[PDB]
Amino acid sequence: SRDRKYLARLKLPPLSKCEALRESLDLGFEGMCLEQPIGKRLFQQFLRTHEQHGPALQLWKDIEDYDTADDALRPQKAQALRAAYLEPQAQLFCSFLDAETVARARAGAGDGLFQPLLRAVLAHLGQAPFQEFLDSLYFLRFLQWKWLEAQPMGEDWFLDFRVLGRGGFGEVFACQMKATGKLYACKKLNKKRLKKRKGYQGAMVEKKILAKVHSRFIVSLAYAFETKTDLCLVMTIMNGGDIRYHIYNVDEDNPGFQEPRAIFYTAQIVSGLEHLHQRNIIYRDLKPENVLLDDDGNVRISDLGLAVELKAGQTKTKGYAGTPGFMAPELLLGEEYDFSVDYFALGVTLYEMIAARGPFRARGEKVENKELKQRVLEQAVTYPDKFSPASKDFCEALLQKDPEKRLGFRDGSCDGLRTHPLFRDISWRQLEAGMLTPPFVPDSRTVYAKNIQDTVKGVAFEKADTEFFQEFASGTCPIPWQEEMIETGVFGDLNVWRP
Amino acid sequence: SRDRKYLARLKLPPLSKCEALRESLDLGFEGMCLEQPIGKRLFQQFLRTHEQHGPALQLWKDIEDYDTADDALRPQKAQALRAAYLEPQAQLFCSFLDAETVARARAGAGDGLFQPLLRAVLAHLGQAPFQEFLDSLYFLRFLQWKWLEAQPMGEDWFLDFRVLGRGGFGEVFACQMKATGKLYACKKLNKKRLKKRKGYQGAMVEKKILAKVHSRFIVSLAYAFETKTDLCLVMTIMNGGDIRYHIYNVDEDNPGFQEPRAIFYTAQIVSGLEHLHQRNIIYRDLKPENVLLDDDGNVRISDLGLAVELKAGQTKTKGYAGTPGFMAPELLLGEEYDFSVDYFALGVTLYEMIAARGPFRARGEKVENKELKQRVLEQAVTYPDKFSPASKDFCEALLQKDPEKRLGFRDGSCDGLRTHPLFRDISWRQLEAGMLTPPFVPDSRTVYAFSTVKGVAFEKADTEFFQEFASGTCPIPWQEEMIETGVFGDLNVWRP
Ligand SMILES: Nc1ncnc2c1ncn2[C@@H]1O[C@H](COP(=O)(O)OP(=O)(O)O)[C@@H](O)[C@H]1O
Ligand SMILES: Nc1ncnc2c1ncn2[C@@H]1O[C@H](COP(=O)(O)OP(=O)(O)O)[C@@H](O)[C@H]1O
Ligand SMILES: [Cl-]
Numbered sequence: 001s002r003d004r005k006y007l008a009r010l011k012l013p014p015l016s017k018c019e020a021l022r023e024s025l026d027l028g029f030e031g032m033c034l035e036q037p038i039g040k041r042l043f044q045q046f047l048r049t050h051e052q053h054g055p056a057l058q059l060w061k062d063i064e065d066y067d068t069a070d071d072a073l074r075p076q077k078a079q080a081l082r083a084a085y086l087e088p089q090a091q092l093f094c095s096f097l098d099a100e101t102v103a104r105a106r107a108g109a110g111d112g113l114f115q116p117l118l119r120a121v122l123a124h125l126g127q128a129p130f131q132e133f134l135d136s137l138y139f140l141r142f143l144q145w146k147w148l149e150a151q152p153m154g155e156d157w158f159l160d161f162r163v164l165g166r167g168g169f170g171e172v173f174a175c176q177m178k179a180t181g182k183l184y185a186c187k188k189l190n191k192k193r194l195k196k197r198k199g200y201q202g203a204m205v206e207k208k209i210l211a212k213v214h215s216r217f218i219v220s221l222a223y224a225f226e227t228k229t230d231l232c233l234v235m236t237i238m239n240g241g242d243i244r245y246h247i248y249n250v251d252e253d254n255p256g257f258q259e260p261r262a263i264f265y266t267a268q269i270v271s272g273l274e275h276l277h278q279r280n281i282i283y284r285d286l287k288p289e290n291v292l293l294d295d296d297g298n299v300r301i302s303d304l305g306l307a308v309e310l311k312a313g314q315t316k317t318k319g320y321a322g323t324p325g326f327m328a329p330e331l332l333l334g335e336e337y338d339f340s341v342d343y344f345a346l347g348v349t350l351y352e353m354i355a356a357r358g359p360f361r362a363r364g365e366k367v368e369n370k371e372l373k374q375r376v377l378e379q380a381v382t383y384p385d386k387f388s389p390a391s392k393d394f395c396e397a398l399l400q401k402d403p404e405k406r407l408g409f410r411d412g413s414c415d416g417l418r419t420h421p422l423f424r425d426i427s428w429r430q431l432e433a434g435m436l437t438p439p440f441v442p443d444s445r446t447v448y449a450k451n452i453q454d455t456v457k458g459v460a461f462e463k464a465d466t467e468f469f470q471e472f473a474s475g476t477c478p479i480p481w482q483e484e485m486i487e488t489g490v491f492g493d494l495n496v497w498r499p
Numbered sequence: 500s501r502d503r504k505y506l507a508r509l510k511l512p513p514l515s516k517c518e519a520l521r522e523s524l525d526l527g528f529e530g531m532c533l534e535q536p537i538g539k540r541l542f543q544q545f546l547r548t549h550e551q552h553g554p555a556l557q558l559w560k561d562i563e564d565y566d567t568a569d570d571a572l573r574p575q576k577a578q579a580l581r582a583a584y585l586e587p588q589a590q591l592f593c594s595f596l597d598a599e600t601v602a603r604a605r606a607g608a609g610d611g612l613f614q615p616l617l618r619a620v621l622a623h624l625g626q627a628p629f630q631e632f633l634d635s636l637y638f639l640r641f642l643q644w645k646w647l648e649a650q651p652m653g654e655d656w657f658l659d660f661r662v663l664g665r666g667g668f669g670e671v672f673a674c675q676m677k678a679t680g681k682l683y684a685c686k687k688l689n690k691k692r693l694k695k696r697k698g699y700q701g702a703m704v705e706k707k708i709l710a711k712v713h714s715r716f717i718v719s720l721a722y723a724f725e726t727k728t729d730l731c732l733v734m735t736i737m738n739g740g741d742i743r744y745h746i747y748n749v750d751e752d753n754p755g756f757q758e759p760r761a762i763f764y765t766a767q768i769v770s771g772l773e774h775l776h777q778r779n780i781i782y783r784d785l786k787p788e789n790v791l792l793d794d795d796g797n798v799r800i801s802d803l804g805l806a807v808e809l810k811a812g813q814t815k816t817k818g819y820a821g822t823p824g825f826m827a828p829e830l831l832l833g834e835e836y837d838f839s840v841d842y843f844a845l846g847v848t849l850y851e852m853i854a855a856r857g858p859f860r861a862r863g864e865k866v867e868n869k870e871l872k873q874r875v876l877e878q879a880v881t882y883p884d885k886f887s888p889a890s891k892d893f894c895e896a897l898l899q900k901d902p903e904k905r906l907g908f909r910d911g912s913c914d915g916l917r918t919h920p921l922f923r924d925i926s927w928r929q930l931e932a933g934m935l936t937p938p939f940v941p942d943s944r945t946v947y948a949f950s951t952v953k954g955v956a957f958e959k960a961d962t963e964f965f966q967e968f969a970s971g972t973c974p975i976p977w978q979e980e981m982i983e984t985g986v987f988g989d990l991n992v993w994r995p
């Protein structure tokens with residue numbers, strides 16, 4: 001319910017207040033016109049009012065359509081595109097394309113169709129048309145939106161109205177951005193408590209990762225600020241409950257998921273993992289309770305405080321980190337490891353979704369750490385009748401104790417893993433675009449969470465503490481903020497030239 | 500209809516191509532946002548998109564409407580405007596006015612109503628809102644239009660398709676601006692002929708005056724350029740013939756005008772005269788054949804080659820110049836003179852419109868220069884029965900031999916002149932806005948209407964004068980063109 005007082009603060013500035021931003025922002029084509037939604041929108045507006053870029057604009061939009069069309073409609077759409085843009089006497093013929101690119105796009109019917117064409121289209125728009133844009137009013141209007149994006153949007157802008165859950169350092173609240181009305185989760189981390197338990201590194205790591213990655217399969221950070229008592233992270237609201245609750249607490253009589261449901265989540269998790277691994281992040285804490293459902297029933301990975309980020313030229317890390325019963329053998333043996341650890345945990349996760357128990361312990365079995373370690377290292381997992389051959393086999397490939405022999409991330413992707421018979425009926429293209437109907441959709445009228453019921457001493461803050469807080473409170477994330485402006489109509493309202 | 504090839508060249512430039520133009524541009528509020536159509540238009544777009552200036556914008560638009568309304572419609576528009584903008588809890592109450600102006604506009608009457616209000620409104624808009632506009636995209640858009648205005652637009656942009664008339668130095672053509680389709684008159688002056696007959700001064704004076712004045716009652720220059728053979732003035736097309744033609748050649752057996760028709764043109768010519776006189780220009784060649792008619796029937800003065808622009812702080816001048824029979828006594832006596840000379844010509848002109856002859860010569864009576872001069876100087880004019888009490892007295896007041904006794908230009912205006920009973924039935928306000936219906940609407944279907952010179956070679960001084968003359972495009976009329984023909988609307992889109 002948009003609070004008008006804060007809505008009134010979303011106004012475009014005079015141009016003289018954008019001079020500093022002009023001289024300081026990364027003016028990269030890819031960053032500005034493809035990844036930042038307002039920048040893309042304004043660039044397309046520029047292309048739309050400049051006749052000579054009409055073909056490039058239209059083709060670009062029509063490839064995106066093709067890329068997210070239903071299977072049955074793709075042949076027809078392929079035909080329309082080739083007729084509109086690739087036949088030489090067509091009104092919207094794209095004469096800027098090399099004839100080789102064109103000829104190649106007029107042939108074939110493969111999965112890659114129109115991807116080299118898109119590259120070509122985007123390569124072209126990154127040259128002259130981009131330059132022309134930078135020299136247009138449309139770019140100046142972008143600077144106006146970036147100015148507004150940089151303006152203080154701290155605690156007062158958010159109305160907390162419910163507790164979604166509890167973490168180690170504070171609660172997570174459902175909240176509302178007052179100006180726009182958009183709902184988010186706000187993870188609150190208590191400052192004194194954080195300092196006391198030396199949680200800076202994990203807190204900062206989660207925030208840096210949630211800020212830099214932009215995946216539909218990982219919770220997105222929109223805002224990061226501090227208050228007198230907390231550090232706060234405002235991120236994607238995930239109202240559907242976590243996988244653990246859904247495994248055990250939704251329908252207690254029949255714990256676990258039917259196979260198709262378990263496969264769907266695995267595919268979504270695999271996609272989130274791939275997105276991390278491509279950017280050299282090892283997650284190190286995949287488990288059912290960290291995979292959250294949204295209202296549509298799509299899942300995302302969360303809780304990134306144990307993650308590690310490999311630096312340039314570093315292919316392995318080391319260290320005892322994670323949740324017991326999800327930590328790979330190579331990790332437990334004190335060896336170097338890479339992304340492999342996450343695929344082992346994916347295996348335990350899949351195992352648990354089908355079997356409604358972990359593969360190394362009986363129900364309610366509470367063991368010494370060393371006993372659990374020896375089971376992970378030495379004990380072969382057994383699979384009950386519930387497992388189909390495909391599920392058994394996939395789990396066996398993931399729970400492989402030797403990381404060399406384990407299914408996972410090879411050649412910069414999970415494509416190998418995607419060919420496994422278990423995903424026989426998944427359209428990966430549609431999964432990645434979010435077009436699939438999830439097999440389970442949470443009831444809006446249900447709270448899918450265990451029930452909720454509501455100072456540490458002798459902690460004074462030195463300079464190094466407040467310096468860490470100010471680093472952490474980096475503020476507004478461009479991409480999510482721009483999504484918000486667009487989604488909620490504010491961009492529409494404010495981006496006007498004449499009514 | 501437009502020629503697409505030339506329409507193609509009307510594109511807004513990249514912003515960086517406007518930075519030189521931005522450095523050199525010296526325009527205040529009045530110049531930018533009130534005088535230049537496009538600037539006004541973009542300034543108003545700005546006010547319209549910023550809620551807080553809504554009241555100012557609408558009160559402004561509504562005062563302009565009251566200023567041009569028919570007489571019978573004014574009281575209701577006065578009441579509506581007071582109720583919309585001058586009452587404290589009206590939605591568009593104008594908070595920024597001082598209560599002293601609010602009170603004054605809230606309870607007046609007569610021709611002066613809302614002019615003190617408009618001044619206050621415009622003064623307000625010229626402060627913060629104007630400063631806001633300079634810091635907006637709308638100002639940069641204006642700079643882009645000015646860039647475009649300044650781009651080469653010479654002979655290739657103009658298709659001549661018919662001869663309108665013949666002058667001393669060449670033909671005048673009906674022509675089309677190829678990009679926009681707009682029709683113009685293109686007066687061509689042959690270069691070799693100008694040099695040979697020593698007409699540079701007269702060419703340039705005409706050009707300069709038409710460029711610097713902007714009145715609905717004087718032909719407007721949109722472009723000045725040169726071809727290999729000619730200097731060219733592209734100006735307002737006047738398709739209704741000239742007044743001389745209409746006096747004598749239309750209904751030959753009933754020559755001259757019915758009095759109201761004469762009064763209408765006198766009123767319009769006076770408006771032209773006044774505009775010139777307010778800008779320190781003396782016409783020195785007011786006569787029936789120089790007053791042209793447009794398609795609607797409205798008239799403009801034309802042919803400004805014998806005119807003179809007084810230098811700043813100069814009040815009188817000298818120079819035997821003009822057409823015999825229209826040159827006033829003081830001019831003929833060799834004395835210093837001012838604008839008075841033009842009111843004398845207006846006397847002669849009006850006289851002729853009524854009598855179908857000039858005041859000093861019977862029909863076909865051709866006399867020596869000295870004899871005509873002596874009549875202008877000594878002869879008292881006689882008035883037949885075709886003149887009414889009012890006509891006669893007005894001509895008498897205009898034809899006074901002594902410029903000090905003569906009706907004309909006082910305290911910076913013709914307001915005295917306007918008060919003559921001859922103008923009993925004329926709304927000067929509506930006339931000056933172009934609102935009055937003309938009493939004669941010329942037919943479309945009627946058109947109411949050289950040799951290469953030897954020994955001429957051109958030197959440095961000649962082609963330099965030609966480049967000085969060829970000053971290019973005139974802002975206001977160009978902006979008027981772009982707005983009228985829809986090019987402004989088409990290129991000003993942000994998202995179609
Ligand atoms: N994006 C979210 N949407 C909804 N609930 C969330 C979200 N993130 C966390 N939560 C809830 O709050 C709890 C604590 O958050 P989490 O990030 O897991 O904290 P910690 O790092 O302390 O484990 C979660 O177990 C979950 O119930
Ligand atoms: N703007 C115009 N529209 C239509 N016809 C015109 C226009 N200007 C001039 N003419 C015609 O061309 C003739 C010559 O123009 P003019 O300016 O009088 O040339 P000059 O200065 O050599 O006398 C005019 O008498 C008139 O018939
Ligand atoms: Cl192909």
Ligand SMILES: [Cl-]
Nearest residue numbers: 105114116117
């Ligand atoms: Cl292709």
Ligand SMILES: [Cl-]
Nearest residue numbers: 135136137138
């Ligand atoms: Cl632009």
Ligand SMILES: [Cl-]
Nearest residue numbers: 358359360361
């Ligand atoms: Cl287990």
Ligand SMILES: [Cl-]
Nearest residue numbers: 604613615616
């Ligand atoms: Cl007033």
Ligand SMILES: [Cl-]
Nearest residue numbers: 634635636637
């Ligand atoms: Cl703006």
Ligand SMILES: [Cl-]
Nearest residue numbers: 857858859860
């Ligand atoms: Cl005469």
Ligand SMILES: [Cl-]
Nearest residue numbers: 864865866867
């Ligand atoms: Cl004579």
Ligand SMILES: [Mg+2]
Nearest residue numbers: 303304305306
């Ligand atoms: Mg955590």
Ligand SMILES: [Mg+2]
Nearest residue numbers: 666667789802
């Ligand atoms: Mg002439």
Ligand SMILES: [Mg+2]
Nearest residue numbers: 802803804805
């Ligand atoms: Mg002349």
